[PDB]
Design a protein around this ligand. Structure first.
Ligand SMILES: NC(=O)c1ccc[n+]([C@@H]2O[C@H](COP(=O)([O-])OP(=O)(O)OC[C@H]3O[C@@H](n4cnc5c(N)ncnc54)[C@H](OP(=O)(O)O)[C@@H]3O)[C@@H](O)[C@H]2O)c1
Ligand SMILES: NC(=O)c1ccc[n+]([C@@H]2O[C@H](COP(=O)([O-])OP(=O)(O)OC[C@H]3O[C@@H](n4cnc5c(N)ncnc54)[C@H](OP(=O)(O)O)[C@@H]3O)[C@@H](O)[C@H]2O)c1
Ligand SMILES: [Ca+2]
Ligand SMILES: [Ca+2]
Ligand SMILES: [Ca+2]
Ligand SMILES: [Ca+2]
Ligand SMILES: [Cl-]
Lengths: 256, 265
């Protein structure tokens, strides 16, 4: 793929996301008085592909994905609303996740923090950006100096306590895409999700590559972008320590 | 106090908070340029400066008005003080230092002990939550209303899990819809005020962490009490909850069951 083609696609995605701005307030007003919001955003993206990129296929949360394989050369993975609980309960702290893979290789990635008007995007060969401003590799963060984010309700409490004690503090935004972007920005040392779907993490691959983040399974391997696996996205300086804590003493799972 | 006087004071405070753009952005810049070792010290220094400047603001506009804040001695501040401001110039210090986000300014005026004006300035998002007795509560001039009823099972809750025993934390997890944490008392409180969270707990706040919230709770029909359901002394602070009216009792029940929420030993 060329830089010229990537920019053309990028230009069309940024325009689509701007059109989304024109539709979403109405969908939100209807929801208020899974949602229609998730399903409509997804359907509109499907129409966008049908119109602009007829060869491209979609793996997304609100459709069946049985026909999506590693043979598909032009693939988008979408979470149309990541943070559905935050959308419904708070109307805040949710995002749109989009990622394009070409012959299996991450080429374009998007995390749109709509409520706060911040577009994180990554373009292979160009870099990562927040609202157009180039992002750089975050400063090194040792676990003891870093805030971490994970779901404490899906782990055994002894392991949750070990994570509390070894880190600087604990926070949770509650949307995978956003908690990940805080790692990307150097605000959090690490974000963990012990059982993500492909759409929860699809954009993050390219961000992790371009910003020198560690993004691995909880066993330290590369993740299958078609399947998802227990995962971490981490600053390079606290990745090993976090994995070590999670896997010590018989591991992080609930004994329950 | 008249609506005319409150507005005059309100207008002054809003203007002063706007002028805070001359201080805060510089501290934020320095969270990048100064070494890790000095960062909390820089924040506490700028906390002290913002506080002193508010002190001077009072001396010049409101000569009898006094100030209760962290960076000054408050030994002489009593229930005898007729005109009292309580201030947290930067609430959410750890978020400022580590994230340069999710921090706020807390300011509250009490007249003869009664909450009259309150401010939570979400500075990174430029969102001024303010409350005025007789007028109501506002976010950037959009008028806030009492939130919908939220039973605990349907609500997101926010608290510091590291300061409670884990059995009680588990009971809070199981009984609520979900768990979130912003990490600044003022902001986690405003999410309760907006109906985004069912409840926020802080088991050991200072007066300045919670001073604004009294008036917001009154005007928006929120329950704001000690963890044993009493009125909180605004001069002293206590273990506290701010909650939607429909999940207040259930949360307190969970916290106080089984010997309470404290850590063991
Ligand atoms: N394994 C984990 O680390 C984890 C993380 C979150 C949630 N959950 C599970 O989700 C159920 C209810 O929601 P919650 O409050 O825990 O999460 P949530 O707060 O509703 O969502 C938190 C984040 O995790 C995603 N998510 C939703 N369901 C998930 C699942 N089953 N496994 C992993 N991630 C998921 C969300 O994606 P969408 O908003 O697009 O759904 C969002 O990005 C729970 O019973 C819990 O087991 C597990
Ligand atoms: N529920 C609680 O008792 C509670 C709540 C928060 C923090 N803490 C403890 O205090 C320390 C600071 O927390 P952090 O590193 O997450 O971030 P933080 O920015 O220091 O504290 C988070 C929030 O609680 C306030 N705070 C600071 N020290 C506190 C204390 N001892 N008790 C209650 N509230 C406090 C903060 O106000 P300022 O930014 O003005 O300090 C902010 O509103 C840790 O040891 C933490 O576990 C306890
Ligand atoms: Ca979703
Ligand atoms: Ca998701
Ligand atoms: Ca505070
Ligand atoms: Ca403070
Ligand atoms: Cl907030």
């Amino acid at each position: 793929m060329t830089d010229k083609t990537l920019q053309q696609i990028d230009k069309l995605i940024c325009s689509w996301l701007k059109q989304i701005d024109n539709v979403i307030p109405q969908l939100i007003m209807e929801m208020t008085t899974v949602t229609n919001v998730d399903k409509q955003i997804q359907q509109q993206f499907q129409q966008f592909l049908a119109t602009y990129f007829p060869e491209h296929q979609l793996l997304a949360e609100e459709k069946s994905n049985a026909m999506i394989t590693n043979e598909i050369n032009h693939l988008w993975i979408m979470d149309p609303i990541d943070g559905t609980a935050n959308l419904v309960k708070q109307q805040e702290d949710y995002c749109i996740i989009l990622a394009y893979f070409y012959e299996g290789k991450p080429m374009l990635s998007y995390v749109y923090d709509y409520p706060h008007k911040k577009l994180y995007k990554a373009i292979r060969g160009e870099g990562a950006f927040c609202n157009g401003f180039k992002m750089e590799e975050p400063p090194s963060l040792k676990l003891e100096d870093a805030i971490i984010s994970f779901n404490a309700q899906v782990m055994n409490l002894d392991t949750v306590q070990d994570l509390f004690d070894a880190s600087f503090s604990y926070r949770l935004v509650g949307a995978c895409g956003l908690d990940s972007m805080r790692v990307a920005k150097g605000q959090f040392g690490a974000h963990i999700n012990t059982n993500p779907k492909p759409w929860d993490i699809a954009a993050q691959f390219l961000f992790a590559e371009l910003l020198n983040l560690k993004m691995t399974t909880l066993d330290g391997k590369a993740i299958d972008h078609l399947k998802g696996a227990p995962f971490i996205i981490s600053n390079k300086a606290c990745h090993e320590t976090v994995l070590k804590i999670l896997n010590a003493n018989g591991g992080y799972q609930k004994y329950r």
